[PDB]
Amino acid sequence: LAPLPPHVPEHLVFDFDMYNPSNLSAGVQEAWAVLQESNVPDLVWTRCNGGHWIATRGQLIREAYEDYRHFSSECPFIPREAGEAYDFIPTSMDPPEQRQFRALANQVVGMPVVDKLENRIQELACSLIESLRPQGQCNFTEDYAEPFPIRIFMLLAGLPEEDIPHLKYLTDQMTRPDGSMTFAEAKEALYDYLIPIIEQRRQKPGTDAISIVANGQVNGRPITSDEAKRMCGLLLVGGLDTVVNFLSFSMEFLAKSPEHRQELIERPERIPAACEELLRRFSLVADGRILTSDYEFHGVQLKKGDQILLPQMLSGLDERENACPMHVDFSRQKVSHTTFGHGSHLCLGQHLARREIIVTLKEWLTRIPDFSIAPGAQIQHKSGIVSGVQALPLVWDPATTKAV
Ligand code: HEM
Numbered sequence: 001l002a003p004l005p006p007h008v009p010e011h012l013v014f015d016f017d018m019y020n021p022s023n024l025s026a027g028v029q030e031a032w033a034v035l036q037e038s039n040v041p042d043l044v045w046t047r048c049n050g051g052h053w054i055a056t057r058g059q060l061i062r063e064a065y066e067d068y069r070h071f072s073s074e075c076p077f078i079p080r081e082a083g084e085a086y087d088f089i090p091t092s093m094d095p096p097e098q099r100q101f102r103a104l105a106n107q108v109v110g111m112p113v114v115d116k117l118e119n120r121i122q123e124l125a126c127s128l129i130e131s132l133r134p135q136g137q138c139n140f141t142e143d144y145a146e147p148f149p150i151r152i153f154m155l156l157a158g159l160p161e162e163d164i165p166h167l168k169y170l171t172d173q174m175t176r177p178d179g180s181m182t183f184a185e186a187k188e189a190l191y192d193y194l195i196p197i198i199e200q201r202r203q204k205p206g207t208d209a210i211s212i213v214a215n216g217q218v219n220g221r222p223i224t225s226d227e228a229k230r231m232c233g234l235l236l237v238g239g240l241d242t243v244v245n246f247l248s249f250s251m252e253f254l255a256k257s258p259e260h261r262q263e264l265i266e267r268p269e270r271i272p273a274a275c276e277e278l279l280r281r282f283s284l285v286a287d288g289r290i291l292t293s294d295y296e297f298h299g300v301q302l303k304k305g306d307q308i309l310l311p312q313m314l315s316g317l318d319e320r321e322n323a324c325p326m327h328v329d330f331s332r333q334k335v336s337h338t339t340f341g342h343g344s345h346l347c348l349g350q351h352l353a354r355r356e357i358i359v360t361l362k363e364w365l366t367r368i369p370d371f372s373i374a375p376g377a378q379i380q381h382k383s384g385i386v387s388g389v390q391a392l393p394l395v396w397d398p399a400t401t402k403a404v
């Protein structure tokens, strides 16, 4: 618990630990939602993890993400040391500069690329699902959620599938720290893999995402090797943990809700809507900004340098945005959320993400419509910048499945 800064008033103090929420065992989303109980301010300060603000309501969260002038992405993560060392592009960049890098990044992961990827996504999901189907069980997170996104990224960046385990080892030690490496060290190791590949793609460019980024033009001039590297770092990890963990939260829910599974089994056309409502209910991201100058925000005095956590996850869980937010209703009429962010940094991979989600849900229910959490298994959730599921043991009667 860091010393309380003089400018922060005692009545706004709420010591929430974003890395180890008090009631995590009851569900990570449930753990964060405590920040939304009637007796909690819209904006509080926690002395945990170095000390920082936390917008607790969709309104303030959306507003801060819109006001990039006061809320910079220069240092987007908590703790401060992680945010300061983080230099990915364009996530650690504020507009107007960020504008064109985002446009270049969009060429390789935006809507265009998606349609061309469908067949590979479709094929990968089925292939993975078919290998499990006859087994009658699996650790969904390990056997499907983990290898799905990386494989998609490899095809996207035109990298050898042989490097998957190595790349997975690199990203894993960065996003799932065990305490052996500082964030910076993990980043360098990851970069050490990318540096040479970019050098090669710059001299002899192909049609892969990496060749496009590395030879792109930004703000009236050629992108530097260093910048290309900083963009590829993000294009790599951006679609990993978020997709892996979200898919897990989804499957855990469906495994525990036979009623909801049947709904989608009988009404397959409702899967797209089910995906949006799940994206809201099981939102899992939470990064933030740093004050560029002293600023009064909704009656609260913020000082230059203050870090503010703007939980993407919380907007959609806000009762004020969605009636009885914790209830999953595939028939919800105005599903509002900021699961993919908000403002100038709104997720460029959102369309790819939705396809990965929808294809997974469609292809899985088609082959394994009836499954459950392994009896006696207590699902453990993890909290952080990208909350998730430690493991998802699943079981099912192979006789109720079918190869397609
Ligand atoms: C269910 C999965 C996903 C979620 C919840 C998610 C979440 C987010 C969030 C909340 C942001 C904005 C962060 C900020 O404002 O600082 C963001 C940005 C980004 N995401 Fe995703 N995302 C997902 C998947 C993907 C995938 C599939 C990729 C693509 C390879 C990806 C790449 C990006 C990129 C490039 C940005 C940076 C955009 C900018 O800074 O201009 N995302 N994502």
Ligand SMILES: CN(C)c1cccc2c(S(=O)(=O)NCCCCCCCCNC(=O)[C@]34C[C@H]5C[C@H](C[C@H](C5)C3)C4)cccc12
Pocket (backbone or CB within 6 Å): 019, 049, 050, 077, 078, 079, 081, 082, 088, 091, 174, 175, 177, 179, 183, 234, 237, 238, 239, 242, 285, 287, 384, 385, 386
């Ligand atoms: C004692 N002190 C002071 C401390 C010191 C050191 C470590 C500590 C840890 S810690 O061990 O948990 N380390 C925290 C840093 C983990 C950063 C994860 C990087 C994610 C990369 N992905 C993104 O780019 C993205 C960017 C964007 C948002 C989001 C999803 C996508 C899109 C990918 C993230 C916790 C608490 C305190 C610690």
